[PDB]
Amino acid sequence: AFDGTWKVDRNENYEKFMEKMGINVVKRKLGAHDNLKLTITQEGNKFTVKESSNFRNIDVVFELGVDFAYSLADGTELTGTWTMEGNKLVGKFKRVDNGKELIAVREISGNELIQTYTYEGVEAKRIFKKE
């Protein structure tokens, strides 16, 4: 299901998303090779997602359907929720600075975890492999 440790394997259109977000060229190259690892654990409707990357190591804790504050690695602050829609995790955020929507979807495909973002008409994915 979502339980376990996932390590990023490949990206699709990620540098275009970062560019749209306002991230500079150098930082985009760093971001695309961030060695991101996610450790996901659940306790009821609450999730703990431990993010470990070249940039930071932080624990992200949220209750499904309850709004919370989250910052992207780059420093952009967001607010919104995660909900379970069928078997996918759907995140509906807003940037605190500009009020624009950022949608994140996390869904299992075979044995991979595909995270899809959407922001201002651009879509990017980061696909993880289990273990």
* Domains of the chain: total: 1
82 appears as a binding residue in the annotation? yes
Experimental approach was X-ray
Cα–Cα distance, 110 to 99 (Å, whole number): 35
Three state DSSP letters for the chain? CCCEEEEEEEEECHHHHHHHHCCCHHHHHHHCCCCCEEEEEEECCEEEEEEECCCCEEEEEEECCCCEEEECCCCCEEEEEEEEECCEEEEEEEECCCCCEEEEEEEEECCEEEEEEEECCEEEEEEEEEC
Q: Which residues contact 106 (CB under 8 A, 6 or more apart)?
A: 2, 88, 89, 91, 113, 114, 115, 116
Identity (one letter) of the amino acid at 66? V
Range of the domain at 104: 1-131
Q: What is the resolution of the experimental data for this entry, in Å?
A: 1.2
125: domain CATH number is: 2.40.128.20
- How do beta strands 122-130 and 4-12 pair? antiparallel
CA–CA dist 61, 122 (Å, integer): 27
Record the tokens describing residue 42, joined without a space.
């659940």
6 carries a ligand binding annotation: no
